[model samples]
Target: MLQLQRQKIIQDITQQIRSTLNVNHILATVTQQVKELMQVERVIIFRLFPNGRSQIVEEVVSSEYAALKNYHWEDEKWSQEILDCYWQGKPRIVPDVINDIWTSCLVEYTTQGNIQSKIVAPILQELGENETGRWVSSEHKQKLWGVLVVHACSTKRVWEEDEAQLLQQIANQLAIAIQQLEH
Candidate 1:
């Protein structure tokens, strides 16, 4: 029964991605889907720039954390990690930033900002693997095109594997959708 529901949700998300061409539409669909799939308090898509600046691109804030949309993390440590992740294009799961070694520096600030849990993933464009050409291509850019950020205000909530898979799939769809729209 659960598998069937999961399949249906995946199908719905695929259809949503195909039907939407604009970035805003894609972001709105993602926000709605994440809210339903993870049962989270908020789902925000942040745009991180290379110059250590970031913006809240899109957000679906539950009543509990609506004010967080206005909060910005410009502090040195918090900003540096954002820049690092942008360059690396790797996903980070700070289940409890306050206790996590990788994110300990920003724990205090994040806690005060009302963030209890976070899962951040980079959105990358998918390019076809070269069959005959060199494996490394200079055309490939690892810059931060966007970020998939999910948060849970209530400490009882934790992300499961299935949930992470769903989010990753959605991020892939969003990346494709953005690429197509830009071209």
Candidate 2:
């Protein structure tokens, strides 16, 4: 994608998200906009709850993919390894879900979604607590608010570096939106 195009999408997302302080509106707008912009099979925004569980707070999916909207992460699916990866602020890209072996846990998710590949980036923000809980972009106690996710069910495709970074940038903007709603 062209730099201008990516910037345009980000600008649109920022405008839409900032358009309202309502969390529901942000989730709906953000998920729809990103899925449309990225031309992917599915896009999901998972919101982490205080009970150590997360679920699809927002999602858009193509007919080829299963509609996992509003589904919660099963207890068995909530493994520490995957949570650690999300907190570490590293984007996980599975070019081929059937072949790209990471953890059995992750592979299981891919299997559940019935997607060939997926990309995941954590939504992190400064919680200003002790250093132990922080992750990804900064040293401040980063709270894992949720995740911005993209899935490819139509085919096995490797996501580009630029696209993944765009997701992270969008997630940052989303984090700000979430924080605003909390306070």
Candidate 3:
């Protein structure tokens, strides 16, 4: 049953992305679907700017949790190393935020925000074809567009392998959608 649901959700999200090139609409659908599939308290699409800043572009959160749809991560406080990991398309599964060995600031931030456990998948854009295009004329062969994150704010949660695969699949779809729009 769970496997069927995952497949169906992936198909639905892909269809929604194909039907419309609207970023906002796709983001809403992705976040909402992911929140439901994972049963997480909050899900967000975080956009990373070239200047090392980040923002929560879209989010679907439980009413009991704090809203962060428009929250911005300060560039000065943001860790380039951490961002680099995401930029490299690394997925982070924090089963328990408090027990994790994160940067001091990150610990404070997540603890304060009530993010007990979370899973993050990077939305990485392939620059092989798009690099020479009008959009990007850079030296890098790949770019980190953003991230898809689901948070279990109310309690500690152990994310499964299947869940990680689903999140990465959705993130990859979002990367393709963004690339299509760059055309």
Candidate 4:
């Protein structure tokens, strides 16, 4: 049945996460798993830093749009607002950037790249005890370290609740994986 296959895929991905200590490996697995799960045109991992900067950590673009990684959004106007939202630890689902008021700035960029849908989720990293000790001189409390933004670049495709939950689970797993590696 469909459910059985889904369960198997989830189990396989979970195993992969547990087996890898490298952050890149974890992200690559997540990208491939998400692409298969949603049957989307692409699944990319965009990492947002604290300074309103972002990087394309990894991407699994569908055959039709394989050249998307070459298009950078670093200096692009939409990057700052998107980075701010992530820094605030909020997730956004823009089904259609072209008509979505919240993501209006991103419309032109996505349109030029032939991208359609996007889901931005914050990747909060809680500094471990030792790491916190190293930052004693700083006056700030613990806060989100970074963000993970995923894109499903296809026609208007609304992410179902189940799909969102799956992506959230993957994000949780990724955060834990990164923490383990930092030590």
Which one is best on TM-score?
Answer: 3
What is candidate 3's lDDT per residue for 31-132, written digit by digit as tens?
899898889999988887766577889999888877888988755333555666665567888788777765445765676568988888988888765333
lDDT of 4 by residue, 1-183 (tens): 577788887899988776686677767887788778778777766554445455667778777765455344443234556545554445777777667766666556577556667676656665535443211113333445444455666567787766665666677667677767864
The list of candidate 2 runs beyond 4 A from truth reads 1-19, 74-85, 99-103, 106-109, 130-140
Backbone clashes (count) for model 4: 0
User: Model 4, which residues run further than 4 Å from truth?
Assistant: 1-19, 70-90, 128-142
Ranking according to TM-score, highest score first: 3, 2, 4, 1
What ranking emerges by lDDT with the best candidate at the front?
3, 2, 1, 4
Among residues 3 or more apart in sequence or in different chains, the pairs in candidate 4 whose N, CA or C atoms overlap within 3 Å are none
Higher-lDDT candidate of 3 and 4: 3
Q: Pairs clashing in candidate 3?
A: none
lDDT of each: 0.65, 0.74, 0.77, 0.62
lDDT of 2 at 55: 78
In candidate 1, residue 78 scores what lDDT? 45
Clash tally for model 3: 0
How many steric clashes between backbone atoms does each model show? 0, 1, 0, 0
Q: RMSDs, each prediction?
A: 10.6, 9.9, 9.5, 9.5
Ten-residue segment with the worst summed lDDT in candidate 2?
A: 131-140
lDDT of 2 at 25: 82
Which one wins on lDDT?
3
